[PDB]
Design an enzyme around this catalytic site. Structure first.
Site, PDB file in Angstrom:
ATOM      1  N   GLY A  54     120.487  15.532  69.281  1.00 40.66           N
ATOM      2  CA  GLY A  54     119.655  14.385  69.596  1.00 40.66           C
ATOM      3  C   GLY A  54     119.496  14.177  71.095  1.00 40.66           C
ATOM      4  N   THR A  89     110.227   7.452  82.023  1.00 41.64           N
ATOM      5  CA  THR A  89     111.381   8.241  82.448  1.00 41.64           C
ATOM      6  C   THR A  89     111.962   9.148  81.354  1.00 41.64           C
ATOM      7  N   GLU A 140     114.390  25.709  66.047  1.00 45.87           N
ATOM      8  CA  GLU A 140     113.503  26.554  66.849  1.00 45.87           C
ATOM      9  C   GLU A 140     114.302  27.499  67.742  1.00 45.87           C
ATOM     10  N   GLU A 172      91.892  28.676  54.573  1.00 48.03           N
ATOM     11  CA  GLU A 172      90.953  28.450  53.475  1.00 48.03           C
ATOM     12  C   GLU A 172      91.651  28.083  52.172  1.00 48.03           C
ATOM     13  N   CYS A 201     108.584  18.659  78.765  1.00 46.31           N
ATOM     14  CA  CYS A 201     107.775  19.664  78.073  1.00 46.31           C
ATOM     15  C   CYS A 201     107.543  20.887  78.955  1.00 46.31           C
ATOM     16  N   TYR A 214     114.481  19.852  64.944  1.00 49.29           N
ATOM     17  CA  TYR A 214     113.551  20.957  65.186  1.00 49.29           C
ATOM     18  C   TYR A 214     113.925  21.749  66.441  1.00 49.29           C
ATOM     19  N   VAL A 215     114.498  21.090  67.459  1.00 49.87           N
ATOM     20  CA  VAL A 215     115.003  21.800  68.638  1.00 49.87           C
ATOM     21  C   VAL A 215     116.073  22.806  68.231  1.00 49.87           C
ATOM     22  N   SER A 231     105.108  14.259  81.173  1.00 54.26           N
ATOM     23  CA  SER A 231     103.859  14.293  80.406  1.00 54.26           C
ATOM     24  C   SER A 231     103.075  12.988  80.534  1.00 54.26           C
ATOM     25  N   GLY A 232     103.722  11.860  80.239  1.00 54.80           N
ATOM     26  CA  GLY A 232     103.011  10.588  80.257  1.00 54.80           C
ATOM     27  C   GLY A 232     102.721  10.078  81.661  1.00 54.80           C
ATOM     28  N   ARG A 277     116.027  16.150  59.270  1.00 59.87           N
ATOM     29  CA  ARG A 277     115.999  14.774  58.778  1.00 59.87           C
ATOM     30  C   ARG A 277     114.763  14.054  59.316  1.00 59.87           C
ATOM     31  N   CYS A 281     108.417  22.073  75.316  1.00 59.23           N
ATOM     32  CA  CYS A 281     107.384  22.773  74.534  1.00 59.23           C
ATOM     33  C   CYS A 281     106.967  24.100  75.165  1.00 59.23           C
ATOM     34  N   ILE A 282     106.782  24.128  76.489  1.00 61.48           N
ATOM     35  CA  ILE A 282     106.236  25.323  77.159  1.00 61.48           C
ATOM     36  C   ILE A 282     107.197  26.514  77.103  1.00 61.48           C
ATOM     37  N   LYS A 308     109.872  26.861  75.230  1.00 59.88           N
ATOM     38  CA  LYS A 308     110.260  27.081  73.832  1.00 59.88           C
ATOM     39  C   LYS A 308     109.217  27.922  73.097  1.00 59.88           C
ATOM     40  N   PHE A 354     111.643  14.772  58.129  1.00 59.75           N
ATOM     41  CA  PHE A 354     110.558  15.596  57.611  1.00 59.75           C
ATOM     42  C   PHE A 354     110.686  15.751  56.097  1.00 59.75           C
ATOM     43  N   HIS A 398      86.646  33.079  55.049  1.00 58.40           N
ATOM     44  CA  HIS A 398      87.389  34.218  54.498  1.00 58.40           C
ATOM     45  C   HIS A 398      87.331  35.420  55.436  1.00 58.40           C
TER      46      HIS A 398
HETATM   47  C1  LIG Z   1      81.170  44.980  56.429  1.00 53.58           C
HETATM   48  C2  LIG Z   1      81.119  43.608  55.800  1.00 53.58           C
HETATM   49  C3  LIG Z   1      82.013  42.626  56.218  1.00 53.58           C
HETATM   50  C4  LIG Z   1      81.988  41.343  55.653  1.00 53.58           C
HETATM   51  N1  LIG Z   1      82.901  40.400  56.109  1.00 53.58           N
HETATM   52  C5  LIG Z   1      82.876  39.197  55.566  1.00 53.58           C
HETATM   53  C6  LIG Z   1      83.852  38.215  56.027  1.00 53.58           C
HETATM   54  O1  LIG Z   1      84.713  38.396  56.897  1.00 53.58           O
HETATM   55  N2  LIG Z   1      83.744  36.981  55.395  1.00 53.58           N
HETATM   56  C7  LIG Z   1      82.829  36.645  54.400  1.00 53.58           C
HETATM   57  O2  LIG Z   1      82.872  35.504  53.921  1.00 53.58           O
HETATM   58  N3  LIG Z   1      81.933  37.581  53.953  1.00 53.58           N
HETATM   59  C8  LIG Z   1      81.962  38.797  54.523  1.00 53.58           C
HETATM   60  N4  LIG Z   1      81.048  39.750  54.095  1.00 53.58           N
HETATM   61  C9  LIG Z   1      80.080  39.375  53.052  1.00 53.58           C
HETATM   62  C10 LIG Z   1      80.650  39.481  51.648  1.00 53.58           C
HETATM   63  O3  LIG Z   1      81.070  40.825  51.417  1.00 53.58           O
HETATM   64  C11 LIG Z   1      79.560  39.135  50.635  1.00 53.58           C
HETATM   65  O4  LIG Z   1      79.002  37.858  50.931  1.00 53.58           O
HETATM   66  C12 LIG Z   1      80.040  39.137  49.187  1.00 53.58           C
HETATM   67  O5  LIG Z   1      80.661  40.397  48.919  1.00 53.58           O
HETATM   68  C13 LIG Z   1      78.869  38.896  48.258  1.00 53.58           C
HETATM   69  O6  LIG Z   1      79.334  38.826  46.894  1.00 53.58           O
HETATM   70  P1  LIG Z   1      78.323  39.056  45.691  1.00 53.58           P
HETATM   71  O7  LIG Z   1      79.048  38.632  44.411  1.00 53.58           O
HETATM   72  O8  LIG Z   1      77.029  38.376  46.018  1.00 53.58           O
HETATM   73  O9  LIG Z   1      78.080  40.651  45.656  1.00 53.58           O
HETATM   74  P2  LIG Z   1      79.001  41.945  45.735  1.00 53.58           P
HETATM   75  O10 LIG Z   1      80.350  41.576  46.198  1.00 53.58           O
HETATM   76  O11 LIG Z   1      78.242  42.944  46.598  1.00 53.58           O
HETATM   77  O12 LIG Z   1      79.121  42.422  44.197  1.00 53.58           O
HETATM   78  C14 LIG Z   1      77.984  42.939  43.472  1.00 53.58           C
HETATM   79  C15 LIG Z   1      78.490  44.039  42.568  1.00 53.58           C
HETATM   80  O13 LIG Z   1      77.478  44.377  41.579  1.00 53.58           O
HETATM   81  C16 LIG Z   1      77.391  45.788  41.513  1.00 53.58           C
HETATM   82  N5  LIG Z   1      76.106  46.160  40.922  1.00 53.58           N
HETATM   83  C17 LIG Z   1      74.908  46.343  41.564  1.00 53.58           C
HETATM   84  N6  LIG Z   1      73.914  46.652  40.765  1.00 53.58           N
HETATM   85  C18 LIG Z   1      74.500  46.674  39.507  1.00 53.58           C
HETATM   86  C19 LIG Z   1      73.983  46.936  38.223  1.00 53.58           C
HETATM   87  N7  LIG Z   1      72.701  47.235  37.990  1.00 53.58           N
HETATM   88  N8  LIG Z   1      74.837  46.872  37.175  1.00 53.58           N
HETATM   89  C20 LIG Z   1      76.116  46.558  37.404  1.00 53.58           C
HETATM   90  N9  LIG Z   1      76.715  46.292  38.569  1.00 53.58           N
HETATM   91  C21 LIG Z   1      75.849  46.369  39.587  1.00 53.58           C
HETATM   92  C22 LIG Z   1      77.628  46.235  42.952  1.00 53.58           C
HETATM   93  O14 LIG Z   1      77.851  47.633  43.105  1.00 53.58           O
HETATM   94  C23 LIG Z   1      78.839  45.351  43.277  1.00 53.58           C
HETATM   95  O15 LIG Z   1      80.064  45.869  42.756  1.00 53.58           O
HETATM   96  C24 LIG Z   1      81.047  41.052  54.650  1.00 53.58           C
HETATM   97  C25 LIG Z   1      80.154  42.034  54.234  1.00 53.58           C
HETATM   98  C26 LIG Z   1      80.176  43.308  54.804  1.00 53.58           C
HETATM   99  C27 LIG Z   1      79.198  44.353  54.328  1.00 53.58           C
HETATM  100  C1  LIG Z   2     113.366  21.527  73.423  1.00 49.22           C
HETATM  101  C2  LIG Z   2     112.175  20.612  73.281  1.00 49.22           C
HETATM  102  C3  LIG Z   2     111.004  21.091  72.696  1.00 49.22           C
HETATM  103  C4  LIG Z   2     109.880  20.270  72.560  1.00 49.22           C
HETATM  104  N1  LIG Z   2     108.733  20.798  71.953  1.00 49.22           N
HETATM  105  C5  LIG Z   2     107.682  20.021  71.831  1.00 49.22           C
HETATM  106  C6  LIG Z   2     106.473  20.585  71.239  1.00 49.22           C
HETATM  107  O1  LIG Z   2     106.330  21.740  70.823  1.00 49.22           O
HETATM  108  N2  LIG Z   2     105.414  19.678  71.149  1.00 49.22           N
HETATM  109  C7  LIG Z   2     105.428  18.360  71.578  1.00 49.22           C
HETATM  110  O2  LIG Z   2     104.394  17.698  71.459  1.00 49.22           O
HETATM  111  N3  LIG Z   2     106.562  17.842  72.146  1.00 49.22           N
HETATM  112  C8  LIG Z   2     107.636  18.647  72.259  1.00 49.22           C
HETATM  113  N4  LIG Z   2     108.784  18.136  72.846  1.00 49.22           N
HETATM  114  C9  LIG Z   2     108.779  16.730  73.259  1.00 49.22           C
HETATM  115  C10 LIG Z   2     108.146  16.511  74.616  1.00 49.22           C
HETATM  116  O3  LIG Z   2     108.845  17.299  75.578  1.00 49.22           O
HETATM  117  C11 LIG Z   2     108.307  15.042  74.994  1.00 49.22           C
HETATM  118  O4  LIG Z   2     107.766  14.223  73.961  1.00 49.22           O
HETATM  119  C12 LIG Z   2     107.615  14.700  76.307  1.00 49.22           C
HETATM  120  O5  LIG Z   2     108.124  15.543  77.346  1.00 49.22           O
HETATM  121  C13 LIG Z   2     107.850  13.244  76.635  1.00 49.22           C
HETATM  122  O6  LIG Z   2     107.179  12.921  77.867  1.00 49.22           O
HETATM  123  P1  LIG Z   2     107.633  11.675  78.722  1.00 49.22           P
HETATM  124  O7  LIG Z   2     106.539  11.501  79.779  1.00 49.22           O
HETATM  125  O8  LIG Z   2     107.928  10.531  77.802  1.00 49.22           O
HETATM  126  O9  LIG Z   2     108.995  12.124  79.455  1.00 49.22           O
HETATM  127  P2  LIG Z   2     109.477  13.396  80.280  1.00 49.22           P
HETATM  128  O10 LIG Z   2     108.526  14.516  80.096  1.00 49.22           O
HETATM  129  O11 LIG Z   2     110.915  13.643  79.891  1.00 49.22           O
HETATM  130  O12 LIG Z   2     109.379  12.906  81.808  1.00 49.22           O
HETATM  131  C14 LIG Z   2     110.284  11.923  82.353  1.00 49.22           C
HETATM  132  C15 LIG Z   2     110.596  12.336  83.776  1.00 49.22           C
HETATM  133  O13 LIG Z   2     111.145  11.218  84.521  1.00 49.22           O
HETATM  134  C16 LIG Z   2     112.293  11.676  85.212  1.00 49.22           C
HETATM  135  N5  LIG Z   2     113.148  10.538  85.524  1.00 49.22           N
HETATM  136  C17 LIG Z   2     114.140   9.998  84.748  1.00 49.22           C
HETATM  137  N6  LIG Z   2     114.742   8.965  85.292  1.00 49.22           N
HETATM  138  C18 LIG Z   2     114.088   8.808  86.507  1.00 49.22           C
HETATM  139  C19 LIG Z   2     114.252   7.886  87.557  1.00 49.22           C
HETATM  140  N7  LIG Z   2     115.154   6.897  87.538  1.00 49.22           N
HETATM  141  N8  LIG Z   2     113.441   8.009  88.636  1.00 49.22           N
HETATM  142  C20 LIG Z   2     112.542   9.001  88.658  1.00 49.22           C
HETATM  143  N9  LIG Z   2     112.288   9.919  87.721  1.00 49.22           N
HETATM  144  C21 LIG Z   2     113.111   9.776  86.670  1.00 49.22           C
HETATM  145  C22 LIG Z   2     112.892  12.740  84.297  1.00 49.22           C
HETATM  146  O14 LIG Z   2     113.840  13.569  84.973  1.00 49.22           O
HETATM  147  C23 LIG Z   2     111.606  13.476  83.908  1.00 49.22           C
HETATM  148  O15 LIG Z   2     111.164  14.396  84.903  1.00 49.22           O
HETATM  149  C24 LIG Z   2     109.939  18.942  73.013  1.00 49.22           C
HETATM  150  C25 LIG Z   2     111.113  18.461  73.595  1.00 49.22           C
HETATM  151  C26 LIG Z   2     112.232  19.283  73.730  1.00 49.22           C
HETATM  152  C27 LIG Z   2     113.492  18.742  74.364  1.00 49.22           C
END
Ligand SMILES: Cc1cc2nc3c(=O)[nH]c(=O)nc-3n(C[C@H](O)[C@H](O)[C@H](O)COP(=O)(O)OP(=O)(O)OC[C@H]3O[C@@H](n4cnc5c(N)ncnc54)[C@H](O)[C@@H]3O)c2cc1C
Ligand SMILES: Cc1cc2nc3c(=O)[nH]c(=O)nc-3n(C[C@H](O)[C@H](O)[C@H](O)COP(=O)(O)OP(=O)(O)OC[C@H]3O[C@@H](n4cnc5c(N)ncnc54)[C@H](O)[C@@H]3O)c2cc1C
Ligand SMILES: Cc1ccc(CNC(=O)Cc2cccs2)cc1
Ligand SMILES: Cc1ccc(CNC(=O)Cc2cccs2)cc1
Lengths: 588, 588
Positions: free
Chosen positions: B387, B252, B295, B571, B149, B291-292, B112-113, B317, B154-155, B157, B319, B566
């Site tokens: 380790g 290395t 996971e 959120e 990695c 973590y190894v 990596s480095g 240990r 990482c890859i 895993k 975390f 939402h």
């Molecule tokens: C298909 C769809 C998908 C959406 N997806 C998302 C999304 O992924 N993320 C997001 O953030 N927003 C989303 N929205 C928007 C979100 O639904 C609205 O922003 C939110 O519902 C607005 O809340 P409100 O309190 O202004 O009104 P509303 O939630 O519409 O509530 C108003 C209420 O007052 C009632 N009412 C009306 N007139 C009267 C009355 N005279 N007397 C009594 N009650 C009355 C209504 O019937 C209703 O029950 C989506 C909207 C739609 C249509």
């Molecule tokens: C199972 C596992 C899971 C991991 N998952 C994650 C993850 O999800 N996210 C993350 O950020 N990190 C993860 N890591 C850590 C990450 O792999 C290491 O932090 C990273 O590979 C370190 O990079 P490096 O360049 O220090 O060494 P390395 O990637 O180990 O490279 C050193 C290289 O030098 C070579 N070398 C050694 N001695 C010599 C020499 N004398 N001459 C020539 N070449 C030599 C080695 O064989 C190797 O190819 C994981 C590690 C393990 C073991």
């Protein structure tokens, strides 16, 4: 001004205690109120830089400056000795329940914003009512408490999106060594809908229980504001009466629009009907190109449908158009057909819906393209997604004085206040605001705190992140590239971009260079990030955390100095280096 | 200040041009070097604050104060008329290749480095060699270019983790309406391994092509540093020779440790062997709790294995231990067994590995618990994850003078310099740094720029985010709760937390209150976020963007004022409110 804040807080709060955290008289009053089950707001003057100035302002009302001081509905009730005497004489409950109106707060609308506002107000002792009613769709569809998102919006839409994503998971699973054959597997629409609707039912019920537990009065009734403090309610039995309230929150949301063409209302459906439909739509035409249109067309295609989208002009108007075109290009390569530059003229019925055996009908759609060529094709289902609109004529008598804009939405100041001082509007009916569920919830919660607990914090509506849940998802936060160039000029904008490939797509043999991201930046302001854009899996999870950094004013250097998490899609944002102006290819 | 930087830059750059963006003479030299295919660094003085002062310091080396000025390996070569003269007389190629050493840079280690450093240095004209050799494991496993990695980390895993996650996607698909029966589906280990190894092979080849296209010399040879500028190499035919380099980067990495017990080397395996193993491990014991270890145990269980984990003391240990216990509890409810407070004493062979029928052997494992009770059970495969260690004795003659710490890692200053002035160390062997792939890549690239392009930017190793890819994933950025309390005291720490349920889990009938997140904050510093923790799906995608905001100093108020997307898991961080000190339940 400290004095104008105090005057507004006293006039507005239902039950409020002015306190200090180190005073044992204030603690004693808190304990009395807690034992009496009297909910209230509290302001701790020793945690405020202007606490001493507040104490002198309090004497305007009470002719004392010491703490504690208890107020009810604009009136000073007493210090420690007076409150404790009322309690010991069993007089305190009557004093704190005394009101000139039936309620401190009436919320019209029981959806995302209105339920959040009502629950929060009740925590501070506001006597609160929430009204909710659902006018049925043209074919008769209706649903329970919770609003658009819960019943016919974000919640069912994303569950059906997940059912569509699982089509590709089943395919990928073969490559990762699982013994299934995706070619031999099919989808049962009615099984999906049954599970989606059973989850929604648990949410309707949970909101009823939550209101009861907060002592909020829930009325399943249609409300109409007829004067600043009077709400007319109509029963399920059509009984009409009037209730009164000090503050009013309008939160009635929007409903889908229909085009003004023959057959649309009679024979088409909208998103309101789709999420509980008991039959699979079959061969489907979606008319429109909003995020609702493309989300619905996308999951119907993944669940086995033959789907066409009829596009009047462009896709996702208002969103970055480079990103919109990549969204549609993926959809077209994965089974969605597009009729571009085309509008409908009439819907004719060829076969009635078979309600008994749960089969769609058949429709003839006639339309025309912008050159003049005619469109005519048969579809089993026709879904209209051509925008949403409020119907405030029904909610609001014109004589009250609440001003609407030219689209019928409420004109509010930055504190959600309408042109009538005690009336507020939140959510989708508030003109100019992003129409999203977490926006409505924040506005409602924060408003209730200002009215009933003396809070000052406003809702910040800028740089609110979004995600479009198309088959390949699109997350964004901030400006589109074209808006940034219009605002600041091409010479002051720099764009860093790259394709990427999810590690999960390698063994599954999916596409090398379709996922894409970019950062739109302002050169003269330390390369400030103006907008972030990502097309890829889990795009809402990717985008969310960056929205905090963008609110904080992140620059490109802030992204560069942060280290990636490997292996993820999101880490690609931490090493972006190819600029658009350089002309170097963004491919992997 | 400026004069010290200029001297260091001129002395170490291979080929460098001092320039101004507006000068047509500088543009002329740039075009000549491009046509001649001569790579070089460029410093644009007009874009630097101290550009005027730099220009005056240059005369200490060149005796002129104008631009352009070209240098090669510490020597002034000429202005524009002089560079054109060399090119016209076919002398320029020989001048830019004149060197006292064989290479400007020798990188020992192609992971990596080291690959990141070598490619980046070559871009500025450094004549570069990268050495890589993979010493085979005890049973004979070896692999190609790219490091731990790419080949055995990482890859592979995360690809096997994805195969395991798809077991639950197949189950969930039934509830969302798909016709399969997970009960009737099985997993084929060798089909998985074939696909994983095909992807790894494409990365091995891609790195060889990348070095070829950057004009980097790749030697598949074991390197040993025998003096500050001499590297002894041993090739595939055991031919020994010496090459020289101006700058040396040690990169290395590490390899797995074995316990010093009878039978461990002969009959057990490590992660080095797992990812290309031709047969399914079968009934498996994983010894260790890193973590190894967790996971690997997690995906083996999801792929149908009978898996046990032998834990000497605690899980993960280093975390956050509340989070570690939640990780282990989920694995225990999803098919992983744990033998706690237990250690192995010997491995005895009952069956040799069956290469005829492509099957594991069989082993008797004897151990004991800390109270002295005995452990004795049979397993088909025993994996040691206790380790990893460098073995720098092989890489580094002690007479060179490179200082190592008590664990055998290289002691470096904050610019990766060792105690020998021309020798640097990056990646896992750099003492005290987080041992992660994006850290090694950033360190290597940024170092190359400082050595060969006059850069000053250092790598920032603080608050580097992590993700543990257990069956339910754990993402983190910053301090654990217990480290925050130790540093600042319990009274200065506030912790906000919540459970959550992914929407995708509702229709699938999965667990209500297992997913969990918290923010650990400092009260006296504006409620600064010291640490962020999340247990849930897609935890690396969730965590990454917040690492930018934490780098920028995010406070709890910064999270509150940001609006959620939402419906997502992420959120939930934008609306946290329950504190641990309140004692209120975090369930939802
Ligand atoms: C298909 C769809 C998908 C959406 N997806 C998302 C999304 O992924 N993320 C997001 O953030 N927003 C989303 N929205 C928007 C979100 O639904 C609205 O922003 C939110 O519902 C607005 O809340 P409100 O309190 O202004 O009104 P509303 O939630 O519409 O509530 C108003 C209420 O007052 C009632 N009412 C009306 N007139 C009267 C009355 N005279 N007397 C009594 N009650 C009355 C209504 O019937 C209703 O029950 C989506 C909207 C739609 C249509
Ligand atoms: C199972 C596992 C899971 C991991 N998952 C994650 C993850 O999800 N996210 C993350 O950020 N990190 C993860 N890591 C850590 C990450 O792999 C290491 O932090 C990273 O590979 C370190 O990079 P490096 O360049 O220090 O060494 P390395 O990637 O180990 O490279 C050193 C290289 O030098 C070579 N070398 C050694 N001695 C010599 C020499 N004398 N001459 C020539 N070449 C030599 C080695 O064989 C190797 O190819 C994981 C590690 C393990 C073991
Ligand atoms: C927990 C609780 C709180 C208040 C009361 C009622 N009155 C008193 O206790 C009288 C006192 C005044 C000053 C010191 S004691 C009862 C119980
Ligand atoms: C655009 C470009 C590219 C390469 C070169 C190379 N140098 C020459 O051919 C030598 C001269 C030509 C004119 C005056 S000296 C020059 C220009």
């Amino acid at each position: 001004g400290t004095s104008q804040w105090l005057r507004k807080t006293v006039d507005s709060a239902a039950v409020i205690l002015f306190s200090k955290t180190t005073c044992p008289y204030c603690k004693k009053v808190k304990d009395v109120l807690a034992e009496a089950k009297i909910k209230h707001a509290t302001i701790e003057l020793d945690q405020l830089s202007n606490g001493s100035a507040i104490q002198k302002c309090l004497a305007s009302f009470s002719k004392i400056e010491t703490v504690p001081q208890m107020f009810v509905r604009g009136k000073f009730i007493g210090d420690s000795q007076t409150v404790l005497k009322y309690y010991s004489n069993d007089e305190l409950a009557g004093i704190v329940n005394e009101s000139k109106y039936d309620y401190d707060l009436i919320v019209i609308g029981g959806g995302s914003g209105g339920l959040a506002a009502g629950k929060e107000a009740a925590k501070y002792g506001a006597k609160t009512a929430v009204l909710d009613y659902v006018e049925p769709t043209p074919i008769g569809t209706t649903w329970g408490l919770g609003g658009t998102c819960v019943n016919v919006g974000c919640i069912p839409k994303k569950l059906m999106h997940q059912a569509g994503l699982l089509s590709h998971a089943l395919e990928d699973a073969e490559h990762f060594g699982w013994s299934l054959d995706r070619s031999k597997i099919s989808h049962n629409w009615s099984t999906m809908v049954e599970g989606v609707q059973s989850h929604i039912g648990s949410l309707n019920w949970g909101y009823k229980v939550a209101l009861r537990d907060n002592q909020v009065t829930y009325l399943n009734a249609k409300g109409r504001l007829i004067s600043p403090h009077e709400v007319q309610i109509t029963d399920k039995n059509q009984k009409v009466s009037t209730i009164t309230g000090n503050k009013i929150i309008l939160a009635t949301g929007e409903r889908p629009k229909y085009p003004e063409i023959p057959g649309a209302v009679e024979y088409g459906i909208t998103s309101d009907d789709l999420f509980s439909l008991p039959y699979f739509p079959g061969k489907t035409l979606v008319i429109g190109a909003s995020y609702v249109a493309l989300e619905c067309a996308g999951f119907l295609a993944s669940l086995g449908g033959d789907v066409t989208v009829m596009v009047r002009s462009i896709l996702l108007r208002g969103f970055d158009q480079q990103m919109a075109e990549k969204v549609g290009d993926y959809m077209e390569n994965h089974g969605v057909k597009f009729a571009k530059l085309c509008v409908p003229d009439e819907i004719k019925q060829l076969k009635v819906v078979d309600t008994e055996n749960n089969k769609p009908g058949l429709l003839l759609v006639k339309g025309h393209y912008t050159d003049g060529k005619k469109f005519e094709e048969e579809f089993e289902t026709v879904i209209f997604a051509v925008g949403r609109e409020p119907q405030l004529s029904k909610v609001l008598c014109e004589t009250v004085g609440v001003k609407l804009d030219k689209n019928g939405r409420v004109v509010c100041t930055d504190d959600e206040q309408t042109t009538v001082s005690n009336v507020y509007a939140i959510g989708d009916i508030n003109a100019g605001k992003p129409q999203l569920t977490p926006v409505a919830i924040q506005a409602g919660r924060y408003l209730a705190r200002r009215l009933f607990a003396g809070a000052t914090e406003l809702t910040d509506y800028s740089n609110v992140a979004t995600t479009v849940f198309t088959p390949l998802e699109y997350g964004a936060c901030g400006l589109s590239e074209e808006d940034a160039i219009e605002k600041y000029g091409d010479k002051d904008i720099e764009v860093y971009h790259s394709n990427f490939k999810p590690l999960e797509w390698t063994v599954a043999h999916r596409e090398d260079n379709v996922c894409y991201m970019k950062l739109v930046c302002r050169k003269s302001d330390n390369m400030r990030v103006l907008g972030l854009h990502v097309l890829g899996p889990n795009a809402g999870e990717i985008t969310q955390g960056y929205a905090v950094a963008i609110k904080m004013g992140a620059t490109k250097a802030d992204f560069d100095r942060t280290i990636g998490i490997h292996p993820t899609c999101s880490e690609t944002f931490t090493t972006l280096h190819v600029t658009k102006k350089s002309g170097v290819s963004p491919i992997v």
